[PDB]
Amino acid sequence: SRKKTCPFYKKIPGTGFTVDAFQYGVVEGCTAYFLTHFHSDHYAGLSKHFTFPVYCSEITGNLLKNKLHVQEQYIHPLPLDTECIVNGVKVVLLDANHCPGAVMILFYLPNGTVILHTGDFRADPSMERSLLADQKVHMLYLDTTYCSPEYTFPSQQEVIRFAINTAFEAVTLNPHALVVCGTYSIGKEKVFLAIADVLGSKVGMSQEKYKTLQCLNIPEINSLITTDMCSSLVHLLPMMQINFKGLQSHLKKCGGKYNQILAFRPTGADVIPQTKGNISIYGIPYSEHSSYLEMKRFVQWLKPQKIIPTVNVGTWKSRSTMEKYFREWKLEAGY
Numbered sequence: 525s526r527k528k529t530c531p532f533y534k535k536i537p538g539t540g541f542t543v544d545a546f547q548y549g550v551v552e553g554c555t556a557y558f559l560t561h562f563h564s565d566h567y568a569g570l571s572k573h574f575t576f577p578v579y580c581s582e583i584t585g586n587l588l589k590n591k592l593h594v595q596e597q598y599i600h601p602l603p604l605d606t607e608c609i610v611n612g613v614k615v616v617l618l619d620a621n622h623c624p625g626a627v628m629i630l631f632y633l634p635n636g637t638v639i640l641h642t643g644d645f646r647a648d649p650s651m652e653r654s655l656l657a658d659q660k661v662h663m664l665y666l667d668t669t670y671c672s673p674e675y676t677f678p679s680q681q682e683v684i685r686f687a688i689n690t691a692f693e694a695v696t697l698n699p700h701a702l703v704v705c706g707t708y709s710i711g712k713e714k715v716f717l718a719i720a721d722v723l724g725s726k727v728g729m730s731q732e733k734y735k736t737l738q739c740l741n742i743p744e745i746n747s748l749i750t751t752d753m754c755s756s757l758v759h760l761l762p763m764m765q766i767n768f769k770g771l772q773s774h775l776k777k778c779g780g781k782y783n784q785i786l787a788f789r790p791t792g793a794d795v796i797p798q799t800k801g802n803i804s805i806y807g808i809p810y811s812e813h814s815s816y817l818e819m820k821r822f823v824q825w826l827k828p829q830k831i832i833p834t835v836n837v838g839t840w841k842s843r844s845t846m847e848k849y850f851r852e853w854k855l856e857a858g859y
């Protein structure tokens with residue numbers, strides 16, 4: 525398999541900087557590799573053999589060190605909201621409101637171009653009150669995961685309220701019911717923690733997952749999570765188990781102590797579960813990405829001059845369609 529070459533949307537023009545570009549070997553000219561967050565599509569390629577500078581948040585740096593064994597000497601964690609000079613360039617990391625340690629990166633280029641790379645983010649009104657507020661941003665590298673008008677979904681808070689009210693009612697109807705959530709990466713902690721909290725329980729999980737959550741600076745985490753599954757009413761399983769076979773199979777462990785499973789999994793408030801026997805799976809629209817409305821609001825507020833989409837950029841047609849939305853957002857706001 526021939527190593528691929530770093531595409532342009534991961535390069536910061538005229539700098540020696542790349543963002544989330546670890547799977548291409550030595551990128552020619554790259555002197556500093558930024559990692560926006562610890563999701564595998566973004567970190568793919570990093571390992572103990574990576575020997576160029578990696579800039580990232582402190583949570584991401586802990587994860588690089590402890591899970592991927594990146595050598596400490598190449599990990600450069602930067603605090604949020606604070607100007608840092610990197611190979612002569614002024615950079616600022618901001619909270620992306622995505623998963624723990626996820627950042628957006630503000631680059632002040634020598635030539636006066638100001639660039640915002642959102643990494644993955646879920647656009648919030650609070651970003652309109654950050655450092656972004658101060659100077660003009662010319663070029664925006666935008667997380668366009670849900671850059672389509674049909675992508676609507678409630679706030680995280682509405683989804684979590686649905687989830688805790690559902691779980692509560694479920695265990696009131698059956699004290700021997702088990703609540704399950706799936707995971708395959710960091711993020712979405714707020715969902716299983718709010719469930720566990722409403723059930724007065726800790727979240728039961730594997731040794732591996734318990735260690736990962738230690739890297740995340742979640743206040744009093746050890747009081748909320750546990751590896752003793754049999755003591756907990758909320759279990760966290762691999763996403764691949766969240767299906768009737770995996771769940772029927774989990775119900776046979778802990779010695780048949782539980783006789784029903786209620787499971788939550790993200791889609792693909794006001795939802796129909798799939799039910800087979802004593803297993804129910806609710807697909808809930810919990811998202812760590814901007815909805816189409818959230819994205820449009822943020823961009824109309826930021827008023828950038830050029831937008832480089834970084835998701836769903838696999839076809840010309842898709843790239844053009846996004847550009848067309850962006851041009852419509854300009855026409856409508858005026859900028």
Ligand SMILES: [Zn+2]
Nearest residue numbers: 561563622644
């Ligand atoms: Zn992500």
